[PDB]
Every structure is written in C-alpha cells, then in structure tokens.
RNA sequence: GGUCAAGAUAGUAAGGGUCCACGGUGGAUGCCCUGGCGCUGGAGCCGAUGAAGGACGCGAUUACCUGCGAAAAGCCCCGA
C-alpha cells in the first residue's frame, strides 16, 4: 500500500521488495509475449508499487537527514 | 375502274441539329464552425540545479499525436 506499509520498514527491505517486483514484472513479460496474459492490469499495478517504493526510500532518506 | 403516258408531291435518318424531360460529372452558391485576423489590455525573461530544440524509449494491443522519462499516458504530500 502507498503510504503506511512502506515507511514502517527498513531501507534494506526496500531493495528486496523492489527486486521481487522487478522479477514478477519480467515473468509477466514472458507470459504476455507468449500469451495470453489473463490479467494485464497487474503489470501496471506492479509498476506503480515499484515507483512508490523508490519514492518512499527517497523521501525517508532525505527526511532522516533533515 | 385497267394499261400506257405527262406532271406534281410524300415518308423512311447512318448520323446531326434546336427545345423538353430524367440522370451523371463537378464543386460554384447559401447556411454553419472546430480556424484565423487585427485592436485594446494584461504579462514578460529561460539556462551548468543542464535551457531553448531534439533522439531513443514508456502502452494488454501502439504506426501517428499527446503526456512522460528505466520511479517512464506517470510516483509523494497538501488544497479543492
Ligand atoms: Mg440510329
Ligand atoms: Mg513519440
Ligand atoms: Mg532510476
Ligand atoms: Mg489528494
């Protein structure tokens, strides 16, 4: 989830959540390219999550150096 | 009436012409606005914190355009 769930965790946990998300996105690319990709949306959704992650760990890393 | 004779005149149009009817072509005309034009008034700088302008990308499907920039038709908080 966008706000809550992210900030509560460590910047070393972010790297992990990122990585796993990357991997799922690639799985979905293989599937899609082979067909069918029953749930397209998930792709975009995962994308968003990645963004959120990198936003948070950015924000936080600069708020802990405020 | 019939034969002959002398004389005169008609219709048929292969194609054309004038007019009428009915179409085709074509895009004038009328109506319209999603686009412009001028005037007045406002507002007036951007850039090494990387500009103006681009290239290549980002889409479930994406060639063009728009928006964006590997956090890629978008991510965070605030306000409506
Ligand atoms: Mg004829
Ligand atoms: Mg383009
Ligand atoms: Mg990056
Ligand atoms: Mg909001």
Curated annotation (Swiss-Prot):
GO molecular function: rRNA binding; structural constituent of ribosome
CDD domains linked to this entry: Ribosomal_L29_HIP (cd00427)
GO cellular component annotations of the record: cytosolic large ribosomal subunit
Highest taxon, organism lineage: Bacteria
PROSITE patterns the record matches: RIBOSOMAL_L29 (PS00579)
Keywords: Ribonucleoprotein, Ribosomal protein, RNA-binding, rRNA-binding
Subunit details: Part of the 50S ribosomal subunit. Contacts protein L23 and trigger factor when it is complexed with the ribosome.
Function: Binds the 23S rRNA. One of the proteins that surrounds the polypeptide exit tunnel on the outside of the subunit.
Family named by the database record: Belongs to the universal ribosomal protein uL29 family.
Protein name in UniProt: Large ribosomal subunit protein uL29
Organism annotation: Deinococcus radiodurans (strain ATCC 13939 / DSM 20539 / JCM 16871 / CCUG 27074 / LMG 4051 / NBRC 15346 / NCIMB 9279 / VKM B-1422 / R1)
Phylogenetic placement of the source organism: Bacteria, Thermotogati, Deinococcota, Deinococci, Deinococcales
